[PDB]
Write a protein that binds this ligand. Structure first.
Ligand SMILES: [Mg+2]
Ligand SMILES: [Mg+2]
Ligand SMILES: [Mg+2]
Ligand SMILES: [Mg+2]
Ligand code: NA
Ligand code: NA
Ligand code: NA
Ligand code: NA
Ligand code: NA
Lengths: 1011, 204
């Protein structure tokens, strides 16, 4: 046969799905969650051989090892070991679309393992093998004998090896297909890899055993009482003497327990499940579970004889919580959630799709430290440990079926086909059977980007029928079809409608109130964080807080999917689509994370942290009103730090304990404050600090902040007069001005400040000229390509208007001597092919103190696309170690992405002023700056700026950060105005109008001086 | 107004005056206005205005200049938004064209007098032999703001000597969501903190 080319065959001899088992033979060990002697890991060194097709595999491999096999660590993705290349494709299938067929050239991974089995496991009960994840399909043999087959790369495949093993040494032979009919359901936007990429284990169960169990928690109206119901099923020798005992513990305390013989209630004319039993435990004043306080109990399920013999024990953590939608709101324990969520793929820059505890933990800590309380499993069931971690650390989870068929045309081609119903159903049903007892899972999802087919309707219903405790959501086909209990669009904007045909993406506020609509709305994806992005993020948070039914969303996405490459000198470097000779590919579309692949945050992370804060603040006079957005906890680990500074100089500060009830408010009156007299702006900054460490944070962690401008004292103080007047010297080619050890030179042919000397040292490498463009961001580029231009993208509009190639024509240049200064006046026009795009008029006023005041007025043609920025630039000769500024910071911040930044006096190393996004672009800006210090220079005004060793030109023409080369000197970009970065999506223009430079006329002013 | 500075310089082809004034109240600096006046051989007077507004003061109703012209002319001609009165938050219906009206049509006789008759988005204004150019909003009538704010019924207003000219770089919206609470939208409040405008006065 060819089972891997038949959607009708998804497994052969596979065991039923069930929640996590360990088959403990001692209840206290079960209780403690200690390891089980009956649950073995088979991870470690295996033998591996690559073939280009299954037909190339030699029959001997089954009976014995291949001389040429290599020894490799399992779990792993063979691509990671260099056997073949990982593929980075977005929507288009990595294979020819011709279901259910696959290429006859189908990379085949032959894995093997000689392992030992204790006689004891074989003297009784059952011994099975468990593959937590094999991509994409595989055959299994034990001791040369064929055991079975399995599909679905993201759920466990279990086989009974009882009859194949023998005492001692045994050998597994695993033939893994990279491609199978299952692939047609695995079209998620990620690296296309293969192999035994999750844990392999061996489990011993007794013949008479616990075959499944479901745990449910129902509450009274005020949640002061609950009933824990556990349905238990057994397999094997059914006898009257059998019983099940379920006990619930809170720590070492048993809070409840029940025992009952088997035989469930009568359910129909043929009777009931004589192999099932439902135990019901009453629990008074249960400690409730939530992402805010992950209160857990432990339930131990004992299978035993009535006379006391324990047969085996299974067990799980239990979170008492109720999830329901009522009156159009998603409620948790009776309260309406505000999902601070993130989509997270399982990705490691070295291991690829293999997950490990340390990584998971690291993601979880980072998520929590950044004010996220929820995660969506985009777009498949995760490694089992993930669930355990979200249960214990506390994060609401969206568990998603491994079904994505985006590459089809139309998108529901398969999901609307009954012949794919069987393959789909397995993906949904086995997920629920495995993960239904985890409190962290609060919503089931049907998969992703597969259109809307009747198969979805059927499976939606199956779930609602088997697990009434969790809503079911599904974005496909328009985000609000009959297969979703929640409206869960991807990239719908806050106020702007995008009325695509058939599946329009309405503004989220508008969506909620369409005629007859009542569901809650939670974006399954929003705020596309690709490269320099997350602009407009606060606009989402504001709507969510204001509209009850706008209950949040999940940012796309947590981590960049970059892979490590090594250079000629073996130095690692971040690779993306196409870096492995993979084609076609979607280049850098695989990197959309809030953090880099090594877990290092991108600057956008901080903007998410702040908008997702759990405390809101208002300032009234000297009173601060703190409002808690926690639903269930009191601010028992929080204090409030406040501080007032005058233009960066600290004046007063204090701490106040925070004591606010969930959804409550606390007023805080500040002490009489400083009344300065001295010019400057007074700013108040408050921070919420966690004095004690937690499971997910260190003492002193800051969970929230906010700033306000208090009184401002405008400087009315006139500067002292100068014992000097600058001298002007002229030539046909220049105007030269001198004042002391300082000189300025203006080129009369170009019209620009071409050189400056401090002492006798030249200060510039390139002249100071206006600049109206930027090395385009991923959002500026969208999907535009060399071969496939997207004319509507910003970058294309600017290229076509000639912005990047415009030449400044001098219209005027004059020099005038004043009473106590020299004034140079210039005007330039930027044109392209006959069109005047921009006009820049300026004045440079150098006076007896050595300062140069630059005044600029620019006009922009109304019919030209709004420019990326309006500013000046130049390459300074100097390379200083540090950058000191008075403005927003300390991190990179842009017009539509600066709420998190705080205004203060910041001081960083040069290098921190550059952001190493993998795909190079304009980066490192800091907005709202009033003074900038670098080497000998100081600049003052009201501007945004950037400074680094790389020219906009260089950034623009380089594709990968590791190819960047520092230039001589420092490139400085000082803008009066800069366009928003966008981010609502990364493939259509997304800069909100209010962040577009469309004024026509712009004015700015700077003073350049020295220190 | 407190003068902080007043200089004059001669340029090659022009004369340049520079001024700085602070506006204070009970020791607080509310606004600071920095100007330049460039008079050239063509007789045009170029005015440049840079204004600072303390952050903690309430956002001002407007940011412009004004004067009482000696002259009283029959018509008003401009190239801007019109023909009728219009304000920042109430200017969609107005069209950009060349309008010409009797001076009286430039005053709106609301029963309860107030600021009225503004036209925004004006690039050119003509009155008598005068001409102003730039990008501004304006009102022109025989009543000072002072008289209007002091008068409760339009029937008690009286034409002052000359013509009052109010030329604004920026003007606050008027609101109207309701009339018993602040209703001017944030995007219509003059809260930028620093304001720039420029105008050319000349004779026509
Ligand atoms: Mg198949
Ligand atoms: Mg025995
Ligand atoms: Mg997709
Ligand atoms: Mg007992
Ligand atoms: Na809400
Ligand atoms: Na992507
Ligand atoms: Na506290
Ligand atoms: Na680039
Ligand atoms: Na009045």
């Amino acid at each position: 046969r060819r089972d891997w080319e038949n959607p009708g065959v998804t497994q052969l001899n596979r065991l039923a799905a069930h929640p996590p088992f360990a088959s403990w033979r001692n209840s206290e060990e079960a209780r403690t969650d200690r390891p089980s002697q009956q649950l073995r890991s088979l991870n470690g060194e295996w033998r591996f051989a690559w073939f280009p097709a299954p037909e190339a595999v030699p029959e001997s491999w089954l009976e014995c090892d291949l001389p040429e096999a290599d020894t490799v660590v399992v779990p792993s993705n063979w691509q990671m070991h260099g056997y073949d290349a990982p593929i980075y494709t977005n929507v288009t299938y990595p294979i020819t679309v011709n279901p259910p067929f696959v290429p006859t050239e189908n990379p085949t991974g032959c894995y093997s393992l000689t392992f030992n089995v204790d006689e004891s496991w074989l003297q009784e009960g059952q011994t099975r093998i468990i593959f937590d994840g094999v991509n994409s399909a595989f055959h299994l043999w034990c001791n040369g004998r064929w055991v079975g087959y399995g599909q679905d790369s993201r759920l466990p495949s279990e086989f009974d090896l009882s009859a194949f093993l023998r005492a001692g040494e045994n050998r597994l032979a695993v033939m893994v297909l990279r491609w199978s009919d299952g692939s047609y359901l695995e079209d998620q936007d990620m690296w296309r890899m293969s192999g035994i990429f999750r844990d392999v284990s061996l489990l011993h169960k007794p013949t008479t055993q616990i075959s499944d169990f479901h745990v449910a928690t129902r509450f009274n109206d005020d949640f002061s009482r609950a009933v824990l119901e556990a349905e238990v099923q057994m397999c094997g020798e059914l006898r009257d003497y059998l019983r099940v005992t379920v006990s619930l513990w809170q720590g070492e305390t048993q809070v409840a327990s029940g025992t009952a013989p088997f035989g469930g209630e009568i359910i129909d004319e043929r009777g009931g499940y004589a192999d099932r039993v439902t135990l019901r435990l009453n629990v008074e004043n249960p400690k409730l579970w939530s992402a805010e306080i992950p209160n857990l109990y432990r339930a131990v399920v004992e299978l035993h004889t009535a006379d006391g013999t324990l047969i085996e024990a299974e067990a799980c953590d239990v979170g008492f919580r109720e999830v329901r939608i009522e009156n159009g709101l998603l409620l948790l324990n009776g309260k309406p959630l505000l999902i601070r969520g993130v989509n997270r793929h399982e990705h490691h820059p070295l291991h690829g799709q293999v997950m490990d505890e340390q990584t998971m933990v690291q993601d979880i800590l980072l998520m929590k430290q950044n004010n996220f309380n929820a995660v969506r499993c985009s777009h498949y069931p995760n490694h089992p440990l993930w669930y355990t971690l979200c249960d214990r650390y506390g994060l609401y989870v969206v568990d998603e079926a491994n079904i994505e068929t985006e590459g089809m045309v139309p998108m529901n081609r398969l999901t609307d086909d009954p012949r794919w119903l069987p393959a789909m159903s397995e993906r949904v049903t086995r997920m629920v059977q495995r993960d239904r007892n985890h409190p962290s899972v609060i919503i089931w999802s049907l998969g992703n980007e597969s259109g809307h087919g009747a198969n979805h309707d059927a499976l939606y219903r199956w779930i609602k029928s088997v697990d009434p405790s969790r809503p079911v959501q599904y974005e496909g086909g328009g985000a609000d079809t009959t297969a979703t209990d929640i409206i869960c669009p991807m990239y719908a904007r806050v106020d702007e409608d995008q009325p695509f045909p058939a599946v329009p993406k309405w503004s989220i506020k508008k969506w909620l109130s369409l005629p007859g609509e009542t569901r809650p709305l939670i974006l399954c994806e929003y705020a596309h964080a690709m490269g320099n992005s997350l602009g407009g993020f606060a606009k989402y948070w504001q709507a969510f807080r204001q509209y009850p039914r706008l209950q949040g969303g999940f940012v796309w996405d947590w981590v960049d999917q970059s892979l490590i490459k090594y250079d000629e000198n073996g130095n690692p470097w971040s690779a993306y689509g196409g870096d492995f000779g993979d084609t076609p590919n979607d280049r850098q579309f695989c990197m959309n994370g809030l953090v880099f692949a090594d877990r290092t945050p991108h600057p956008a992370l901080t903007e998410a942290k702040h908008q997702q804060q759990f405390f809101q603040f208002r300032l009234s006079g000297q009173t601060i009103e703190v409002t808690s957005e926690y639903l269930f906890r009191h601010s028992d680990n929080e204090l409030l730090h406040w501080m007032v500074a005058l233009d960066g100089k600290p004046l007063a500060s204090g701490e106040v304990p925070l004591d606010v009830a969930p959804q409550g408010k606390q007023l805080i009156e500040l002490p009489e404050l400083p009344q300065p007299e001295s010019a400057g702006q007074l700013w108040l900054t408050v921070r919420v600090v966690q004095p004690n460490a937690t499971a997910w944070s260190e003492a002193g962690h800051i969970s929230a902040w906010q700033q306000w401008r208090l009184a401002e004292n405008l400087s009315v103080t006139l500067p002292a007069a100068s014992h000097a007047i600058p001298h002007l010297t002229t030539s046909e080619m220049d105007f030269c001005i001198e004042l002391g050890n300082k000189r300025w030179q203006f080129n009369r042919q170009s019209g620009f400040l071409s050189q400056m000397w401090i002492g006798d040292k030249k200060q510039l490498l390139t002249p100071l000229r206006d600049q109206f463009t930027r090395a385009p961001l991923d959002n500026d580029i969208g999907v535009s390509e060399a071969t496939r231009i997207d004319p509507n993208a910003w970058v294309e509009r600017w290229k076509a208007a000639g912005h990047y190639q415009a030449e400044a024509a001098l219209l005027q240049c004059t020099a005038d001597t004043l009473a106590d200064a020299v004034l140079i006046t210039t005007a330039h026009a930027w044109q392209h092919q006959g069109k005047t795009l921009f006009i820049s008029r300026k004045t440079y006023r150098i006076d007896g103190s050595g300062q140069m005041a630059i005044t600029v007025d620019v006009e922009v043609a109304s019919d030209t696309p709004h420019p990326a920025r309006i500013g000046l630039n130049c390459q300074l000769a100097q390379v200083a170690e540090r950058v000191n500024w008075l403005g927003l910071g300390p991190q990179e911040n842009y017009p539509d992405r600066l709420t998190a930044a705080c205004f203060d006096r910041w001081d960083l190393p040069l290098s921190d002023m550059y952001t190493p996004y993998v795909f190079p672009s304009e980066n490192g800006l800091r907005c709202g700056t009033r003074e900038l210090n670098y080497g000998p220079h100081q600049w003052r005004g009201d501007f945004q700026f950037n400074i680094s060793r790389y020219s906009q030109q260089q950034l623009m023409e380089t594709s990968h950060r590791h190819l960047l080369h520092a230039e001589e000197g420092t490139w400085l970009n000082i803008d009066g105005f800069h366009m928003g970065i966008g981010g609502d999506d990364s493939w259509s223009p997304s800069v909100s109008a209010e962040f577009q430079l469309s004024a026509g006329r712009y004015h700015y002013q700077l003073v350049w001086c020295q220190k």
